[PDB]
Amino acid sequence: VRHVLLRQGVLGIKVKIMLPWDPTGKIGPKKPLPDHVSIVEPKDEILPTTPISEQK
Amino acid sequence: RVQPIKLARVTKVLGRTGSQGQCTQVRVEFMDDTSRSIIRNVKGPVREGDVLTLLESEREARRL
Amino acid sequence: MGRVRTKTVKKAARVIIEKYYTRLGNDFHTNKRVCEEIAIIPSKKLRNKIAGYVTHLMKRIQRGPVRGISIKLQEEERERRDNYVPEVSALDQEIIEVDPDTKEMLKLLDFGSLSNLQVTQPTVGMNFKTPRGPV
Amino acid sequence: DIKLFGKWSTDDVQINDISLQDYIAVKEKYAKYLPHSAGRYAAKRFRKAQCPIVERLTNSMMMHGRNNGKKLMTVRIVKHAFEIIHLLTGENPLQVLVNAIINSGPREDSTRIGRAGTVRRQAVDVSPLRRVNQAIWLLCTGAREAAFRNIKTIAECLADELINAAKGSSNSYAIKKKDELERVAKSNR
RNA sequence: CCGAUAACGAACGAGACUCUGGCAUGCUAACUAGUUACGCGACCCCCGAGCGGUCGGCGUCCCCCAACUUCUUAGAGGGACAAGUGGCGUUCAGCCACCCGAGAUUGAGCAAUAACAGGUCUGUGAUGCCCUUAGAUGUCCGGGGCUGCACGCGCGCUACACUGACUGGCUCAGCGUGUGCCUACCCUACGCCGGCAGGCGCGGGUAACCCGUUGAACCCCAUUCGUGAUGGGGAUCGGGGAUUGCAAUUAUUCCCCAUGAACGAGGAAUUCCCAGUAAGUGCGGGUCAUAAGCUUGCGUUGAUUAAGUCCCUGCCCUUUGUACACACCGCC
Ligand SMILES: [Mg+2]
């Protein structure tokens, strides 16, 4: 919040900025939004073949 | 000549009435004749199954 | 009263169900234990609420096809739709009960006198239409 | 076996009408050594029904600003009143209290909002829980105005209030107000 | 929220969130917190107990000269999700009851768009314009006033008494503060003098180390009183003694002795409140050289009633009417 001293009086300025999320944290908060839900993408893991036994 | 006091068990609670909610209206079954059941409005906390006195037997019945 | 879940939990539950239907189960604790690694939940309360809704939706899924997409349900539906053509068709009837007016139509079309058509006796009375108005 | 206040066994007390036998709590499952238990009886509806009626009398006997936390004083008042009624009558103080509750509960009242006939438009019978509540309130109130500005102490006033109520003599404020309510309801029939 | 659906896809608000209270004999840690055990002791029983009982008496992080975290503290974690059972439900969204559970609705904070000629220029070296600016509306000093009283109103405190007052004894808290940039003014243990308010020396504490184991009040247990304007009430008023200050008169506050006035529960009206709540009851902080009938918090005792309604006062959504749009305190 800042004040501008103009010839007609005082003008009030209010600036609000929503910082973007970043894990690095040097541009914004490290934590995500509380209601933001992120889901990791699953892989295939199909295994459609006959059972085998691999020696390792 | 005056009717004696007789008991009756609340079988169902229809709903509140009186427009302030001070009365709850119930369907109530007589002890002397189980097949006889009327609708009476009662005041105070009421849950089905409890029994209560009827100083006068039939007063008024009116579905909400 | 006041236990209605919101979009934040419902959408997340549906998404994780359609993503990890194999890993999820009907146990609330097992589901809330898979949630921490299948999703990033900022709050423990949010995580367990989502897990509870996942349990509810999986009970509904195992009792019936909930709108949430599921590969086993879809392959069953596919098998039940693009198959089960009967060995005999439903349109190869030996005899077709045919109206005399339709027989005249076929005769004008020149497809009259077919061995697979049996002419019905036309009804008499002309008593169609519902009675007008009430009563 | 329980012996409330060390004496006055509960098992001999019998409620004479089945209307209030689900709301009076003197039976052995609700018999307590002392009428003081922070039981959270107001947390849910109909939880005061299983609260012992001696506890209810103790809770309703502590009123009028000066006495809102003095439950120990109210317990000693109830103990002295039970002693006095036992000496005066010879029967169980619990039985006297139960009979007083039964004879004080007004079987019907009147309630409505619109243009009043005499007091209310409609005469309405009451619930057993409301019977018990009204009876306890009437007994405590009668004892209070009996003991306010006379030498006779609150213990004797409560004692003879219960004594008069357990029989029915028109000498107790509880049954006087009960009769007034019954007459108003009968007129509003 | 489910669902329908000329809408689809979103955004804020709500929720989510943070703090707080409740369970963790699970983990970490404790000489600025303790517990248990042991050893010196002090006292009772000593008939005889004797590993008898009490100790907020002294010790065992005095460094080898005990362990441990239950109690206290505070961190990381867990735990509660309508999860399980039954019923209702379009068998969806959900609701009701119950089991197990510390908890199946703990209280706050934050809080949308649009506005009000709502309040503050007496918060600011925030400020436009106007006014004043040397006999000042600047600033400083002395005195007075902001208290002034035929009266009306608001927030409160004390009461009207025996569910009490007095006298004595017994016995229990938690918030939280405490020595100053200017800035002088801190919380106080113990000893002595005084009847009290106070005073005089010795210390401790910049603080889980000292006040302080915060020996609080109410309550509890005994005494006197005895239904009277009485030992209820302590207003008014006289005299005297201290404390703060530069100064106490229009009495700062406190103490002592006298006076016991209205007040015997309060018309018409009207406020607040659903569980550790109302109320009774004291104790901290702010104001403070002196000080609380105020306010903000804390603890102690602990209920009656209700789990409903739109009747009064209002609020939200939909339909509807309008001659209103400064919007019914309208218009006419
Ligand atoms: Mg005196």
From Swiss-Prot, chain A:
Sites bearing Phosphothreonine, chain numbering: T49, T50
Cross-link (Glycyl lysine isopeptide (Lys-Gly) (interchain with G-Cter in ubiquitin)): K31, K43
Residues with Phosphoserine modification: S38, S53
Cross-link (Glycyl lysine isopeptide (Lys-Gly) (interchain with G-Cter in SUMO2)): K43
UniProt effect for mutating K43R: No effect on sumoylation. Abolishes sumoylation. Abolished ubiquitination by RNF10 in response to ribosome stalling and deubiquitination by USP10
PTMs per UniProt: Methylation by PRMT1 is required for import into the nucleolus and for ribosome assembly.
Coiled coil: none
Effect annotated for changing T50A: No effect on phosphorylation by MAPK. Significantly reduces phosphorylation by CDK1 and nuclear accumulation. Greatly reduced phosphorylation by PRKCD. Abolishes phosphorylation by PRKCD
Cellular localisation: Cytoplasm; Nucleus; Nucleus, Nucleolus; Mitochondrion inner membrane
Domain of life: Eukaryota
Protein's job: Component of the small ribosomal subunit. The ribosome is a large ribonucleoprotein complex responsible for the synthesis of proteins in the cell. Has endonuclease activity and plays a role in repair of damaged DNA. Cleaves phosphodiester bonds of DNAs containing altered bases with broad specificity and cleaves supercoiled DNA more efficiently than relaxed DNA. Displays high binding affinity for 7,8-dihydro-8-oxoguanine (8-oxoG), a common DNA lesion caused by reactive oxygen species (ROS). Has also been shown to bind with similar affinity to intact and damaged DNA.
Protein family (similarity comment): Belongs to the universal ribosomal protein uS3 family.
Protein name as catalogued: Small ribosomal subunit protein uS3
From Swiss-Prot, chain B:
Chief localization: cytoplasm
Ribosomal protein in keyword set: yes
InterPro entries linked to this entry: NA-bd_OB-fold, Ribosomal_eS28, Ribosomal_eS28_CS
Subcellular localization, as worded in the UniProt entry: Cytoplasm, Cytosol; Cytoplasm; Rough endoplasmic reticulum; Nucleus, Nucleolus
Keyword Phosphoprotein: yes
Modified residues (Phosphoserine): S37
GO cellular component: a single term: synapse
UniProt superkingdom: Eukaryota
GO biological process: cytoplasmic translation; maturation of SSU-rRNA; ribosomal small subunit assembly; ribosomal small subunit biogenesis; ribosome biogenesis; rRNA processing; translation
PROSITE patterns listed in its UniProt record: RIBOSOMAL_S28E (PS00961)
Gene3D superfamilies xref list: Nucleic acid-binding proteins
Keyword tags: Acetylation, Cytoplasm, Diamond-Blackfan anemia, Endoplasmic reticulum, Nucleus, Phosphoprotein, Ribonucleoprotein, Ribosomal protein
Pfam families (alphabetical): Ribosomal_S28e
GO molecular function: RNA binding; structural constituent of ribosome
UniProt disease annotation: Diamond-Blackfan anemia 15, with mandibulofacial dysostosis: A form of Diamond-Blackfan anemia, a congenital non-regenerative hypoplastic anemia that usually presents early in infancy. Diamond-Blackfan anemia is characterized by a moderate to severe macrocytic anemia, erythroblastopenia, and an increased risk of malignancy. 30 to 40% of Diamond-Blackfan anemia patients present with short stature and congenital anomalies, the most frequent being craniofacial (Pierre-Robin syndrome and cleft palate), thumb and urogenital anomalies.
Annotated family: Belongs to the eukaryotic ribosomal protein eS28 family.
Name of the protein in question: Small ribosomal subunit protein eS28
Species this protein is from: Homo sapiens
UniProtKB/Swiss-Prot annotation, chain C:
Family listed: Belongs to the eukaryotic ribosomal protein eS17 family.
Cross-link annotation Glycyl lysine isopeptide (Lys-Gly) (interchain with G-Cter in SUMO1), location: K103
InterPro entries per the UniProt record, alphabetical: Ribosomal_eS17 (IPR001210), Ribosomal_eS17_CS (IPR018273), Ribosomal_eS17_sf (IPR036401)
Disease link: Diamond-Blackfan anemia 4: A form of Diamond-Blackfan anemia, a congenital non-regenerative hypoplastic anemia that usually presents early in infancy. Diamond-Blackfan anemia is characterized by a moderate to severe macrocytic anemia, erythroblastopenia, and an increased risk of developing leukemia. 30 to 40% of Diamond-Blackfan anemia patients present with short stature and congenital anomalies, the most frequent being craniofacial (Pierre-Robin syndrome and cleft palate), thumb and urogenital anomalies.
Record protein name field: Small ribosomal subunit protein eS17
UniProt cross-references to Pfam families, sorted A to Z: Ribosomal_S17e
Gene Ontology BP terms: cytoplasmic translation; erythrocyte homeostasis; ribosomal small subunit biogenesis; rRNA processing; translation; translational initiation
Keyword Nucleus assigned: yes
Residue list for modification Phosphothreonine: T130
Record localization: Cytoplasm; Nucleus, Nucleolus
Linked residues for Glycyl lysine isopeptide (Lys-Gly) (interchain with G-Cter in SUMO2): K103
NCBIfam families to which the protein is assigned, alphabetical: PRK01151.1
GO CC aspect terms: cytoplasm; cytosol; cytosolic ribosome; cytosolic small ribosomal subunit; focal adhesion; membrane; nucleolus; nucleoplasm
GO molecular function, one term: structural constituent of ribosome
SUPFAM superfamilies in the cross-refs: Rps17e-like (SSF116820)
Modified residues (N6-succinyllysine): K19
Main location: cytoplasm
Entry-annotated residues carrying Phosphoserine: S113
PTM (free text): Ubiquitinated at Lys-103 by RNF14 and RNF25 in response to ribosome collisions (ribosome stalling).
Keyword presence, Transit peptide: no
From Swiss-Prot, chain D:
PROSITE patterns per UniProt: RIBOSOMAL_S7
GO cellular component: a single term: ribonucleoprotein complex
Gene Ontology biological process terms, A to Z: cytoplasmic translation; regulation of translational fidelity; ribosomal small subunit assembly; ribosomal small subunit biogenesis; translation; translational initiation
Single GO molecular function: RNA binding
InterPro entries in UniProt: Ribosomal_uS7, Ribosomal_uS7_CS, Ribosomal_uS7_dom, Ribosomal_uS7_dom_sf, Ribosomal_uS7_euk/arc
Modified residues (Phosphoserine): S127
Cellular compartments annotated: Cytoplasm; Nucleus, Nucleolus
Alphabetical keyword list: Acetylation, Cytoplasm, Isopeptide bond, Nucleus, Phosphoprotein, Ribonucleoprotein, Ribosomal protein, Ubl conjugation
Record has Transmembrane as a keyword: no
Cross-link (Glycyl lysine isopeptide (Lys-Gly) (interchain with G-Cter in SUMO2)): K32
Principal place of residence: cytoplasm
Positions where N6-acetyllysine occurs in the chain: K32
SUPFAM superfamilies: Ribosomal protein S7 (SSF47973)
Quaternary structure, from the entry: Component of the small ribosomal subunit. Part of the small subunit (SSU) processome, composed of more than 70 proteins and the RNA chaperone small nucleolar RNA (snoRNA) U3.
UniProt family annotation: Belongs to the universal ribosomal protein uS7 family.
Protein name (Swiss-Prot/TrEMBL): Small ribosomal subunit protein uS7
Organism whose genome encodes this protein: Homo sapiens
